[PDB]
């Protein structure tokens, strides 16, 4: 999936994806749908996950420490939608930037990892349809997936990764 980026990320900045951090969609729509978006909390929300990696990044984790066996998701409070939900992945979805503007990842494997996370969330919440939508807004640091590589911050429009439905 092509992920456009404002400052052309160099080839050296092509980290593996070793987890993520999401936030629940508040409200009460009786329709059997549970919407998750990229986190909206401050840096404290990401630090509370304890997935300290060699890369300081928003939206999704990079070059961190992966999971032992399968995906592990720990949230300080599930019913509470204000507190974010962390995620560690079993296998990483490598994200390689072409060097120019775009930064591309797998076209389909991302859908597979999304379905895996969606089932791991189904088991936690109601066994119902799950939807991944993009960020609800915020500052350019957290609205656009930012990562601090080699002394430079690179922002990328992650709108291409969160437009999925799973029944």
């Amino acid at each position, epitope marked *: 999936i092509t992920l456009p980026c404002r400052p052309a990320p160099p080839p050296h900045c092509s980290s593996n994806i070793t987890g993520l951090i999401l936030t629940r969609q508040g409200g*009460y*729509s009786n329709d059997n749908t549970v919407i998750f978006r990229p986190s909206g909390g*401050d840096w404290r929300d990401i630090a509370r996950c304890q997935i300290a990696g060699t890369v300081v990044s928003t939206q999704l984790f990079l070059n961190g420490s992966l999971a032992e066996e399968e995906v592990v998701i720990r949230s300080e409070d599930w019913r*509470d939608n204000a507190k974010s939900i962390c995620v560690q992945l079993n296998t990483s979805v490598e994200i390689n930037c072409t060097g120019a503007g775009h930064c591309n990842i797998s076209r389909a494997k991302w859908n597979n990892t999304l379905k895996q996370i969606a089932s791991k969330l189904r088991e936690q919440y109601g066994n119902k349809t799950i939807i991944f939508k993009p960020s609800s807004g*915020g500052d350019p*640091e957290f609205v656009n997936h930012s990562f601090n590589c080699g002394g430079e911050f690179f922002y990328c429009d992650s709108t291409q990764l969160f437009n999925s439905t799973w029944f």
Partner: antibody
Amino acid sequence: QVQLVQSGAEVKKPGASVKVSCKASGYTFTGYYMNWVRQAPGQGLEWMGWINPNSGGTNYAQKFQGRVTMTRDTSISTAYMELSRLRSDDTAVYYCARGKNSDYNWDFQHWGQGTLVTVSS
Amino acid sequence: IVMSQSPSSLAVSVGEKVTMSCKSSKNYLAWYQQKPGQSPKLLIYWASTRESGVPDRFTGSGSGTDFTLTISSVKAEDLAVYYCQQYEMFGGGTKLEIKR
């Protein structure tokens, strides 16, 4: 000496947009999440959304997505809730709320005085 | 994860003992009192934890999906509507009227 002061009541035509303000004084504005609660006229309280005053990230209610946007101005410590596609059935009293402890939300100790927005032709 | 609050209306005499229920669907529950013409005030902020300055007659209880608010010695000033909140959901109802 904490104080949350909202804007004044006003009228908008169906489909227009209304931006309600919330000036906060008496604490570190960037510490406590800011929520916006709408009280329908005699029909109970329904929460709309919350905004983080640092990252600016927002979590809206599934009933208001695609119709609301929350923003902030930390230089003057003012939250903003803008509502577009204004339906005539959305005339209510809009409050801004904070919470007692910076860690936990949803225990609104402070409230604004209110803001009665009216929507009619 | 909806919630209901009962009874809707409730008329009583001064000094009488009042007890209202809130059925959800040491938990994080709150009770707000909205007096005529004012914004809500947080009476109880953790199922049974009264706010600073809240007189002692107000007591909250409950652990499971059911909870309860109670006023021992009602007073004319306690006339108001009472809301029970869990996370992002408010119960509504429970208007405390006064006999005279």
